[PDB]
Amino acid sequence: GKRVDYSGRSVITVGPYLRLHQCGLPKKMALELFKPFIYGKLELRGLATTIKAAKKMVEREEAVVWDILDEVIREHPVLLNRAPTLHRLGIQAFEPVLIEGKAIQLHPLVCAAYNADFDGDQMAVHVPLTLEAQLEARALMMSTNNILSPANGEPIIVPSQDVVLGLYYMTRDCVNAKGEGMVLTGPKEAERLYRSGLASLHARVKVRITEYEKDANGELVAKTSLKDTTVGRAILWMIVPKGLPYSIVNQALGKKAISKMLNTCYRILGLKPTVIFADQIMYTGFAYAARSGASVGIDDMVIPEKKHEIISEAEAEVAEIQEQFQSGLVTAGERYNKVIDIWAAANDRVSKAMMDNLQTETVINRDGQEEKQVSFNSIYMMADSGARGSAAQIRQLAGMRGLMAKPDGSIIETPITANFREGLNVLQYFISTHGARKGLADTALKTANSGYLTRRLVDVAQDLVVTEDDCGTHEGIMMTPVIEGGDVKEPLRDRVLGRVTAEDVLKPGTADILVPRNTLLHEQWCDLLEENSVDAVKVRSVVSCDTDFGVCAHCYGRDLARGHIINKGEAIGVIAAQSIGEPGTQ
Amino acid sequence: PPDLRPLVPLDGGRFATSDLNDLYRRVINRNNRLKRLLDLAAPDIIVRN
Amino acid sequence: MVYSYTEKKRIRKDFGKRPQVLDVPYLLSIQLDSFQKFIEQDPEGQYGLEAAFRSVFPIQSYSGNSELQYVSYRLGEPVFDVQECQIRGVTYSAPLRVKLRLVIYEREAPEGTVKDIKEQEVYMGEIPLMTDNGTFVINGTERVIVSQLHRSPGVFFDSDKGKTHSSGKVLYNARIIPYRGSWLDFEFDPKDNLFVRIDRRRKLPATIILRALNYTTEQILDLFFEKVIFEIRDNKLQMELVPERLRGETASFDIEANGKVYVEKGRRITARHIRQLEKDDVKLIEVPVEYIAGKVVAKDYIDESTGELICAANMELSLDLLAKLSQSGHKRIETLFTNDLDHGPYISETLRVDPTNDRLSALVEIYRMMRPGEPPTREAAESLFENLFFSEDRYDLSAVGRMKFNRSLLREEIEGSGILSKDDIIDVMKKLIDIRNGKGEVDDIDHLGNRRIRSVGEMAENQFRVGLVRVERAVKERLSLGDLDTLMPQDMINAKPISAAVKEFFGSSQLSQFMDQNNPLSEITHKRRISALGPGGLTRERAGFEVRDVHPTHYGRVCPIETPEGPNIGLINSLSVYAQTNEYGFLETPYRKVTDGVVTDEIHYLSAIEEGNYVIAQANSNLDEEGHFVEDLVTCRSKGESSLFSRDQVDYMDVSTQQVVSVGASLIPFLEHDDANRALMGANMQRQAVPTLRADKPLVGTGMERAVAVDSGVTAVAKRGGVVQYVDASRIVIKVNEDEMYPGEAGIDIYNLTKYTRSNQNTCINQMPCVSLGEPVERGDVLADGPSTDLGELALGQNMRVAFMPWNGYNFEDSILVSERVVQEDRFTTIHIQELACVSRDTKLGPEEITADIPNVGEAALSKLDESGIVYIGAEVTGGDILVGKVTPKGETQLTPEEKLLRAIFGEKASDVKDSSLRVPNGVSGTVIDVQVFTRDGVEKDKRALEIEEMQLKQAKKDLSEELQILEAGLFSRIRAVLVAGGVEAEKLDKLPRDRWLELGLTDEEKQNQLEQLAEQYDELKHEFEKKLEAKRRKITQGDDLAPGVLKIVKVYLAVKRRIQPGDKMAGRHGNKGVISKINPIEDMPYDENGTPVDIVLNPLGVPSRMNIGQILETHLGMAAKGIGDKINAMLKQQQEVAKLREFIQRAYDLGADVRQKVDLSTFSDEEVMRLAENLRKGMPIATPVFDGAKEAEIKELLKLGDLPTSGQIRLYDGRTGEQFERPVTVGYMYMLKLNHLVDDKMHARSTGSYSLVTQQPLGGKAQFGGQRFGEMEVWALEAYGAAYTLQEMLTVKSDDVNGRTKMYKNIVDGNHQMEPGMPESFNVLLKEIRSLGINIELED
DNA sequence: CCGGCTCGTATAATCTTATGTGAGCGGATAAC
DNA sequence: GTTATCCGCTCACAATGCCACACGCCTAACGAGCCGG
Ligand SMILES: [Mg+2]
Ligand SMILES: [Zn+2]
């Protein structure tokens, strides 16, 4: 670890107007970094002769220098870094956009990959300065080239909490609103109805949609129909590209739904529509999250009406078990077990009652009498969309909270009968402090142990590089989908997606070559292997690869974080050690 | 090479010493004292010590 | 009811329902009581310096009959008072005087009378005193000693099960921890042999340390075991029996008596058969002979006829020895009673393990354990074993050690010696054997009956005793050859090691920390701090996990929620609110004595051990007005476990609902609606809130900020009650009421408020007056608002209008948007104060000058300087300009032995000049507010230093003239009033000066003559004021001493003003951080239907994830407070009548359930009401106690009193589109802080800077103009891509290749992007220090 | 009139809340 | 007996990264210096 010239440090800040391949750079710090490029551009254009004239001109900060600096920036990328680097997405390269400020702006979709807060997290800046370094930082490391993760083939550009709330609030329905049941021409007329205030954002309506489907072999097929949908869904359809079918935006669109929206858009179309589609999603998600106005208030946490008598019946039952212990019929251990069972049952009943009271209380007039629907409550939209929180956190807010366990390892008799909307008294808060400090100490030591194990694994696997193409053997392993005895945990599709077959696995129709012996199990081919219900597939591993001083290519299969088979040189031992050692904190 | 264990320039008076320089000074003092004791036909107990 | 004269300025509306009975004590009591206990004239010498002088002295030579004894001690007056000591640089010391009496005897008579006694006041050392705020002053700065939490002196019986031998068998070690001395441990091996060790050496059998105190083996077996008596009947002998010994056994034979068969063979002995023997009362039964086949004879037996040793003590018996004792007639035979369950033969096995046999051999064996190779000699081993335990010099338990050691053995008295005894060690062995048997249990460590706190005075006297021991060794070595009758006891007491030890501990220990002066909260929570690190305790990487969790006896003694997080959690605990240090050093906490039915008000204090016997009610238990538990079963607790008890069963009740927490988290309103993690983060982030330009009270605060802001030191409090007589911006002069004047010449009071000066975190400590002229104040009331205070209320940040809504993504995870109205009202602007010094140094080649003559610089940079070489007071300078012009001589090669004579006198001491002027660092700016000049005694002062002299001299004249003018007027009134007697003429009086009134002739009464004598007494008082002025000017005029080498010092302060900008960190009191993302204009804000914009947009998504739900209740209550404020403002702008205003304030102050204030405005007499309205018109301040909060419905009714909506949600419009935000949003007033993680302390950059010396790498840090550490994991990351050339630049061109990097720099400036690889210089460094070992290492080819 | 004092400076000394490994070596331990 | 193993004791070696900040880094006695008594 050598310290490095042309570097810098700041605190960061969001800036949601950026594109994906650029970042906000402070003006003064960018004049400070690129001083020799500035000196060269000044002595080229005749505006100075010596180096000292250029030093005086750039210490006066004259108005020619900013135009010169903008000529210096234009196509010259910059590396950014966050300090506890775990996995290889820790440092990435962007282009700069100049900012009159003192902080670094940073595109919000990337912020999950850095695992960055905005709680005061600091970042650092390095400069590629030669020609090959600029060209590597543009090709191998620009942030439009890192969508899928190297640990598993999943997009790392999932839209986060606020965009989730915006898109979930746009694409819903309610059974009586302005302009319900009218008819429309395009999606743009639905937009023009939303702006004028004539029709509301979610009122059901038949529209006309043209959609393109590329089942024709390399071209697009138009198809025009009338579909029963929503004004918000017709507005969101205007940023979907040509490829996808309309049933991707007809549902309620929580978090996993838009994640697989991005994933199917990556599968069918390519790279550039995936990047530009993530940008349009981020922009319109923030826009309609602004126009929502989704607040939170103390009257958005509905207490159940039946909490009181459930606690009263639980107290009657524990008094009865206490009397059965007092007469001497039941021993102390079974008394303990009966009490913990009945408080578990009472907690589950209270949680069921509060969730049933929140999710569907909203009754609205039909233009007939009354109906039922999913609610428009605040925290229920914050949980049901999967933006922040689970059933557990929203359970502790209004229903009673769990059973706190003492640090000895036992679990206490009397559970915390209160929620957070009501007040906790002295003893119960003093009990909750145990779990607080226990979790904090566990995090404090877990960090260091994960760091040391990652250090040792990347020491082991460092000298190993994919070095030749085809070792050409006929060994390997046999994969079957794992089954404990409960449910099948991992199917055969997920494990043996993208690994090169060892032997020709025959069809269940015997003596029929279902797969050639030396091909790559890509996705369509994996489905056509799945259809005949194959239980065991033999496949080439790395542990039986033949190549001296390295690993052959077909013995490793396709690469993660990109699409095709792996190129000769990818230092797979280091990315493997990082992929094991990265989630060790969790 | 003595640039690779440099003598710390303080402000006012004396220079602050490193650790290697103190260890080499101790070794050289001990070596000179033993060489002089070999030069003067010392008794065996003292040269052993 | 009746309120103070500042308490009537505003009233905080107090919710909370419980009647309190005990107010908050003085929050800094522990520091002041400790250091007051340290230095005090103490009879009986149990503690303080007197104990340290009684422990060592008298000191005497090696029977040379020269001896030094001790008379008394005295502390000299401080030569320097506090503020100028903080300016100049020294400690706030105090000198010490010791009256020593050197005696020498007359020879051939040791009890003979001494012939020479010599008494002196020897000077030794300097002991630092304590400021009135509990702090110390060390090197110009102000430092605090943190209290320590360590293990108790005494004894412990730990188990430590598990990991030994992997068999599951537990162990039982017993440790004795002395207060000053050496350890003592007892252990078990899995062979059940009982071992001893001392000071963690190697193991020994405990039999030898039991023998070494003059014990025979039969005495050992008599003490540690009982007896069974066999009597030899001549055939098939008998056995005595108490039948309870047979319990839990298997009968080896047919147990029977009087023909009645009790137990058959093979049957285990039942308690039924035991009761049969109880009824039958059997004393003897008749065993078979072989039953003694395996037992052990207790004591030794010889042949009474021949002297043959038949069997010794602790011998395993056989039938041959039984036959021989029957032949010798030894019928009465003792036998060790053994068992596997109750009385285990544990000692006898160990006594058969050990090799060592008797007393002198035992002393030899211990003496060989302690030091190997030394000659085993009788007297040396005897002296070693005496000095380990049985002497005062090197084994001292305290009183606390004797306390715990008599308590943990069920003794009776609690006063014993500071040494051990025979009974102590054998009782430790007996108790350890009993614990191994099964009765009794272990003592867990985390329980606070075993962990004491050390305050400052005890650590101070320990270090002082260490220094006294070193000086004692030196003076004993000197006085051992004491043979001179001219020796006086200054010749022998070297005052260097005592001062070295005292200044070592107070200056740079591990427990002498800086005090964080950026809140009054930060100071008062840093002094109240209980630490577990340092000497005597553990370290932060060897503490495990059990000492960090919450033991269930932290209740009311240690705050559960205030702690640092990160590396050291649970070691730096903060002290509770009502906690008191015990008489011995444990932590006692208050409780209320309860009789049979009546909860009384007689408060008691309880230790950590006494609490686990009684029954204690929880605080919020509803009561009567007479005092009765109104329910029947009450939530209470007995021993670590809360439960539900009866009504005529409780004994003690809590004092208040505050006592669980500390002062750092009793200031969070609605704390009881928060997850404990976020309460921890809020309680950590309050004490980093930087102070603001204009301070501002909080609307929603707990009822605690008045005691915090007063009981700290940042505000000034009137000591005596009176009338305000003079108020300037600088000082306040108070006339004292005549009831509070002690009758000899009391007069007035003067408070000199501290102006803009430096704090330790470079923030601006300030004081301002808050009383008007001619206004009454009362004793114990505030006068000067310090930093972040407001009318005697702690007030850290400011409170603002906040809307919870997502606004265009500018608040994505935790970011905060701020409108420009917060900037234009400059209400987070912060003053900072930097300090820069410059010294003139006595180098070679000539000295250095402070002159204004600098070559190679322009005239314009010399303009801000005066002719003396120093910038003026108040010249607004920026980064780069010259503060102080200093020049250095530069020869370089002159070498003439005559030219240097003329250059040192005639040649100005200046031949060729190198510029070494103190310049402003880069970036920083500001306004020079203060310059200090310090000149060595001997150099003549420069004229600017003389200007400072004259200014300070006029300052010294002014105040003394003020006191003379105010003092002489009483005797002026007296000469006039006695001149009334006899005859006075007032028209003739006032035409001529006052001495002429004094010399106005009148017939001599006795009263006028005594008052004339008092007139010359004020004349000599005037002479005394003259000598006061002379005493001031001899201090000011005289030059300074300095460090060896320095001529003069110039100190320059600067002050700079920091506005707010995107990047700073603001955060509420509930743990909700944020970086200011954008800074919007006013018209892009969400405005409500009335038109007023909203200052700050938060993000709602942060509320359901982390359960900090109390902030929304704070938001609603704050909107209710400002809602009352707007109606009060509307009633004052219309200037309505005070009766209606009185009525509205009264109706706003009743409002709710059974609150305990009950104010009534029928005593405020139509002027306090208007002043109270002028204070309340910006909002009505509201109190909320922590665990006695305001319910939801009362917030609803207070929102109903104003015209606000009940739901707390208002329709909000849009700044950009002018449309409506559809659902209603939440607006309110939240109180926010500004933390000192400012962006202009972090944004740091580098293109090409400096380099280090050893390896040619760039330096690190911001100040040294460094580059970032592109560390190891980032290299793994670049290897993980296909990046190859970029790794080569980050490894070689950017650093450690010298020719490579200069070639690269020239190549960039030329406009060609190539590179030159080279080879790093640090690798050649690695080669040159591997070759420094015996390792050849080269490079092939 | 040399060092008594006073200084320049070169250089020696009586803990005590940790865990988990591996790895080796000395003392007991069970056979022809 | 004597030989090939088994077991308990003692001891070296590891424990994330980065940042700021701040204050610390000898002297009683052996070879010289000044000049007083
Ligand atoms: Mg963060
Ligand atoms: Zn292979």
Tab-separated table of N, CA, C and O in Angstrom, chain A residues 1-3 5-7 9 14 16 37 88 102 118-119 130 136 161 169 290-291 295-296 378 388 393 420-422 427 429 437 455, chain C residues 548 618 673-674 804 806 812-813 815 1065 1105-1106 1192 1219 1222-1223 1226 1240 1244 1246 1251 1267-1269 1272 1280-1281 1284 1289 1291 1294 1313:
chain	number	residue	atom	x	y	z
A	1	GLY	N	0.793	-1.210	0.000
A	1	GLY	CA	0.000	0.000	0.000
A	1	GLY	C	0.829	1.264	0.000
A	1	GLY	O	1.228	1.755	1.057
A	2	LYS	N	1.057	1.829	-1.173
A	2	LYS	CA	1.822	3.055	-1.298
A	2	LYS	C	0.868	4.225	-1.435
A	2	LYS	O	-0.160	4.117	-2.103
A	3	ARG	N	1.200	5.341	-0.802
A	3	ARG	CA	0.400	6.531	-1.015
A	3	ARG	C	0.671	7.075	-2.403
A	3	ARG	O	1.729	6.849	-2.985
A	5	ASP	N	0.151	10.102	-5.491
A	5	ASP	CA	-0.105	11.471	-5.912
A	5	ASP	C	-1.327	11.537	-6.820
A	5	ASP	O	-1.799	10.529	-7.332
A	6	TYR	N	-1.801	12.766	-7.043
A	6	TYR	CA	-3.039	13.069	-7.770
A	6	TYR	C	-4.226	12.358	-7.131
A	6	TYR	O	-4.947	11.606	-7.781
A	7	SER	N	-4.416	12.578	-5.839
A	7	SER	CA	-5.540	11.984	-5.142
A	7	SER	C	-6.251	13.059	-4.341
A	7	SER	O	-5.815	14.207	-4.276
A	9	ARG	N	-9.837	13.709	-1.294
A	9	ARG	CA	-10.810	13.148	-0.375
A	9	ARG	C	-11.904	14.169	-0.134
A	9	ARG	O	-11.644	15.372	-0.147
A	14	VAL	N	-25.816	13.481	-2.625
A	14	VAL	CA	-26.505	12.670	-3.624
A	14	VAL	C	-26.471	13.265	-5.026
A	14	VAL	O	-25.701	12.810	-5.871
A	16	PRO	N	-29.359	13.902	-7.540
A	16	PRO	CA	-30.137	12.970	-8.360
A	16	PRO	C	-30.331	13.376	-9.811
A	16	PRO	O	-31.186	12.789	-10.474
A	37	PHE	N	-1.704	19.093	-16.636
A	37	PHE	CA	-2.457	19.168	-17.881
A	37	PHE	C	-2.803	20.612	-18.218
A	37	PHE	O	-2.727	21.023	-19.383
A	88	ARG	N	-14.902	-6.268	-5.584
A	88	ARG	CA	-14.229	-5.554	-6.661
A	88	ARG	C	-15.052	-4.429	-7.264
A	88	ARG	O	-14.535	-3.724	-8.134
A	102	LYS	N	-18.319	22.145	-2.460
A	102	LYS	CA	-17.199	21.554	-1.741
A	102	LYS	C	-17.413	20.078	-1.432
A	102	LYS	O	-16.689	19.522	-0.606
A	118	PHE	N	-25.334	8.169	3.565
A	118	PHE	CA	-25.054	9.589	3.478
A	118	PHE	C	-25.046	10.169	4.874
A	118	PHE	O	-25.370	11.333	5.086
A	119	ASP	N	-24.666	9.343	5.826
A	119	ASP	CA	-24.548	9.669	7.229
A	119	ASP	C	-23.237	10.346	7.569
A	119	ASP	O	-22.849	10.359	8.738
A	130	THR	N	-1.899	8.280	-17.603
A	130	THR	CA	-1.230	7.923	-18.844
A	130	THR	C	-2.270	7.719	-19.936
A	130	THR	O	-3.412	8.159	-19.820
A	136	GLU	N	-8.027	1.932	-20.143
A	136	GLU	CA	-8.523	0.844	-19.305
A	136	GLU	C	-9.671	1.299	-18.431
A	136	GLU	O	-10.657	0.573	-18.272
A	161	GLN	N	-34.868	2.505	-2.293
A	161	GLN	CA	-36.065	2.697	-1.479
A	161	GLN	C	-37.023	3.758	-2.033
A	161	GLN	O	-38.235	3.522	-2.137
A	169	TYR	N	-46.394	3.763	-5.847
A	169	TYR	CA	-47.543	4.641	-5.707
A	169	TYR	C	-48.159	4.974	-7.052
A	169	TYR	O	-49.367	5.209	-7.127
A	290	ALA	N	-42.146	12.538	-5.611
A	290	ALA	CA	-42.330	13.904	-5.143
A	290	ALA	C	-43.794	14.296	-5.181
A	290	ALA	O	-44.335	14.805	-4.196
A	291	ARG	N	-44.464	14.033	-6.304
A	291	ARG	CA	-45.874	14.398	-6.418
A	291	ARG	C	-46.795	13.564	-5.547
A	291	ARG	O	-47.965	13.924	-5.420
A	295	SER	N	-46.286	11.050	3.397
A	295	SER	CA	-45.709	11.346	4.694
A	295	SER	C	-45.916	10.186	5.651
A	295	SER	O	-46.304	9.087	5.261
A	296	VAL	N	-45.663	10.440	6.927
A	296	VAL	CA	-45.954	9.512	8.008
A	296	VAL	C	-46.370	10.338	9.217
A	296	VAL	O	-45.833	11.418	9.459
A	378	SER	N	-49.936	4.846	5.058
A	378	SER	CA	-48.574	5.285	4.769
A	378	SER	C	-47.566	4.163	4.973
A	378	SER	O	-46.878	3.745	4.030
A	388	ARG	N	-38.744	0.032	2.723
A	388	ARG	CA	-38.066	-0.150	4.001
A	388	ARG	C	-38.984	-0.867	4.967
A	388	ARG	O	-40.157	-0.514	5.092
A	393	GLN	N	-40.753	-5.106	11.749
A	393	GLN	CA	-40.572	-3.756	12.260
A	393	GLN	C	-41.911	-3.046	12.410
A	393	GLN	O	-42.202	-2.457	13.461
A	420	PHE	N	-44.398	0.568	20.351
A	420	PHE	CA	-43.719	1.854	20.354
A	420	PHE	C	-44.646	3.054	20.264
A	420	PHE	O	-44.231	4.153	20.638
A	421	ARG	N	-45.868	2.894	19.768
A	421	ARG	CA	-46.778	4.031	19.741
A	421	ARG	C	-47.256	4.361	21.140
A	421	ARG	O	-47.368	5.533	21.504
A	422	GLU	N	-47.516	3.347	21.945
A	422	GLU	CA	-47.655	3.615	23.357
A	422	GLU	C	-46.277	3.675	23.987
A	422	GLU	O	-45.264	3.361	23.362
A	427	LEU	N	-38.811	-0.724	33.310
A	427	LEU	CA	-38.259	-2.073	33.301
A	427	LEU	C	-38.137	-2.633	31.902
A	427	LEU	O	-37.146	-3.291	31.575
A	429	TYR	N	-37.839	-1.042	28.978
A	429	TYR	CA	-36.778	-0.407	28.213
A	429	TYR	C	-35.415	-0.882	28.693
A	429	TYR	O	-34.507	-1.155	27.884
A	437	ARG	N	-27.070	-3.762	23.185
A	437	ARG	CA	-25.618	-3.830	23.360
A	437	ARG	C	-25.041	-5.152	22.880
A	437	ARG	O	-23.893	-5.185	22.410
A	455	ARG	N	-8.612	-11.795	4.108
A	455	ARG	CA	-7.184	-11.610	3.880
A	455	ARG	C	-6.498	-12.939	3.605
A	455	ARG	O	-5.727	-13.058	2.643
C	548	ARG	N	-18.900	-6.569	29.039
C	548	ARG	CA	-19.474	-5.483	28.268
C	548	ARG	C	-20.993	-5.424	28.335
C	548	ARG	O	-21.563	-4.365	28.062
C	618	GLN	N	-41.281	-0.455	41.477
C	618	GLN	CA	-40.969	0.370	40.329
C	618	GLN	C	-41.589	1.751	40.545
C	618	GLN	O	-42.467	1.932	41.392
C	673	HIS	N	-40.163	6.319	23.495
C	673	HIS	CA	-40.737	5.857	22.245
C	673	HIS	C	-39.627	5.636	21.231
C	673	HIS	O	-39.734	6.115	20.106
C	674	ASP	N	-38.546	4.960	21.603
C	674	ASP	CA	-37.386	4.874	20.724
C	674	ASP	C	-36.708	3.525	20.872
C	674	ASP	O	-36.683	2.961	21.963
C	804	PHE	N	-42.082	16.336	6.504
C	804	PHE	CA	-41.699	14.963	6.176
C	804	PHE	C	-42.313	14.579	4.842
C	804	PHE	O	-43.481	14.201	4.788
C	806	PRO	N	-41.008	13.142	0.509
C	806	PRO	CA	-39.941	12.971	-0.482
C	806	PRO	C	-40.011	14.108	-1.488
C	806	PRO	O	-41.031	14.273	-2.155
C	812	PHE	N	-32.179	11.341	-0.245
C	812	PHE	CA	-32.374	9.962	-0.676
C	812	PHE	C	-32.232	8.924	0.429
C	812	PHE	O	-33.228	8.288	0.780
C	813	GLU	N	-31.052	8.736	1.018
C	813	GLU	CA	-31.029	7.877	2.200
C	813	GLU	C	-31.236	8.675	3.472
C	813	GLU	O	-32.207	8.455	4.198
C	815	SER	N	-30.105	12.278	3.453
C	815	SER	CA	-29.769	13.652	3.132
C	815	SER	C	-30.872	14.600	3.570
C	815	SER	O	-32.015	14.210	3.798
C	1065	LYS	N	-22.849	18.326	8.435
C	1065	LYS	CA	-23.636	17.272	9.066
C	1065	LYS	C	-24.529	17.875	10.138
C	1065	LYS	O	-24.032	18.385	11.145
C	1105	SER	N	-38.135	2.155	9.277
C	1105	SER	CA	-37.055	1.178	9.332
C	1105	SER	C	-36.444	1.121	10.717
C	1105	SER	O	-36.527	0.102	11.405
C	1106	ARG	N	-35.822	2.207	11.137
C	1106	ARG	CA	-35.259	2.307	12.467
C	1106	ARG	C	-36.318	2.902	13.382
C	1106	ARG	O	-36.912	3.933	13.071
C	1192	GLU	N	-50.807	11.067	24.112
C	1192	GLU	CA	-51.262	11.550	22.812
C	1192	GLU	C	-52.390	12.557	22.961
C	1192	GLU	O	-52.394	13.595	22.286
C	1219	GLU	N	-49.027	23.303	-7.857
C	1219	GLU	CA	-50.096	22.334	-7.736
C	1219	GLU	C	-50.236	21.940	-6.276
C	1219	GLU	O	-49.672	22.574	-5.385
C	1222	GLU	N	-50.877	15.629	-2.941
C	1222	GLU	CA	-52.199	15.016	-2.879
C	1222	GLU	C	-52.568	14.603	-1.464
C	1222	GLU	O	-53.535	15.110	-0.889
C	1223	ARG	N	-51.820	13.690	-0.890
C	1223	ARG	CA	-52.090	13.305	0.477
C	1223	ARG	C	-51.567	14.393	1.406
C	1223	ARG	O	-50.715	15.188	1.015
C	1226	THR	N	-46.822	15.899	6.883
C	1226	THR	CA	-46.630	16.264	8.278
C	1226	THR	C	-45.646	17.417	8.377
C	1226	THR	O	-44.488	17.277	7.974
C	1240	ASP	N	-15.151	22.006	5.347
C	1240	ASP	CA	-13.829	22.626	5.256
C	1240	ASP	C	-12.938	22.246	6.424
C	1240	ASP	O	-12.261	23.067	7.030
C	1244	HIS	N	-9.708	17.769	0.895
C	1244	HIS	CA	-8.263	17.861	0.784
C	1244	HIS	C	-7.821	17.262	-0.537
C	1244	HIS	O	-8.373	16.257	-0.985
C	1246	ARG	N	-4.369	17.027	-3.661
C	1246	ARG	CA	-2.936	17.068	-3.907
C	1246	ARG	C	-2.672	16.725	-5.357
C	1246	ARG	O	-3.212	15.742	-5.858
C	1251	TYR	N	7.689	14.757	0.118
C	1251	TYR	CA	8.008	13.338	0.191
C	1251	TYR	C	8.723	13.025	1.493
C	1251	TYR	O	9.340	13.892	2.111
C	1267	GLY	N	-0.953	12.684	0.230
C	1267	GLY	CA	-1.776	11.917	-0.673
C	1267	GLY	C	-2.434	10.767	0.069
C	1267	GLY	O	-2.050	10.405	1.177
C	1268	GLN	N	-3.445	10.193	-0.567
C	1268	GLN	CA	-4.276	9.201	0.093
C	1268	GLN	C	-3.591	7.843	0.116
C	1268	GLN	O	-2.730	7.545	-0.711
C	1269	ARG	N	-3.975	7.007	1.079
C	1269	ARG	CA	-3.390	5.672	1.173
C	1269	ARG	C	-4.173	4.735	0.275
C	1269	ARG	O	-5.222	4.219	0.652
C	1272	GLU	N	-3.970	-1.869	0.621
C	1272	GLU	CA	-3.756	-3.219	0.113
C	1272	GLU	C	-5.002	-3.772	-0.561
C	1272	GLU	O	-4.918	-4.389	-1.636
C	1280	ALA	N	-8.439	-7.675	-9.395
C	1280	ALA	CA	-9.664	-8.400	-9.684
C	1280	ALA	C	-10.305	-7.967	-10.989
C	1280	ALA	O	-11.060	-8.741	-11.580
C	1281	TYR	N	-10.025	-6.761	-11.458
C	1281	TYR	CA	-10.366	-6.400	-12.823
C	1281	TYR	C	-9.275	-6.923	-13.736
C	1281	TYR	O	-8.419	-7.717	-13.350
C	1284	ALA	N	-4.102	-3.557	-15.499
C	1284	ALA	CA	-2.689	-3.853	-15.339
C	1284	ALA	C	-1.835	-2.603	-15.327
C	1284	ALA	O	-0.994	-2.448	-14.440
C	1289	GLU	N	0.923	2.412	-12.543
C	1289	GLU	CA	1.057	3.814	-12.158
C	1289	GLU	C	0.852	4.000	-10.667
C	1289	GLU	O	1.653	4.671	-10.016
C	1291	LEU	N	1.525	2.047	-8.388
C	1291	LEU	CA	2.643	1.488	-7.647
C	1291	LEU	C	3.970	2.162	-7.938
C	1291	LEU	O	4.851	2.144	-7.075
C	1294	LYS	N	3.421	7.135	-9.631
C	1294	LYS	CA	2.924	8.079	-8.650
C	1294	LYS	C	3.788	8.141	-7.402
C	1294	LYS	O	3.747	9.154	-6.701
C	1313	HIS	N	1.785	11.646	-23.498
C	1313	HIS	CA	1.426	10.654	-22.489
C	1313	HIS	C	2.176	9.360	-22.780
C	1313	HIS	O	1.694	8.481	-23.493
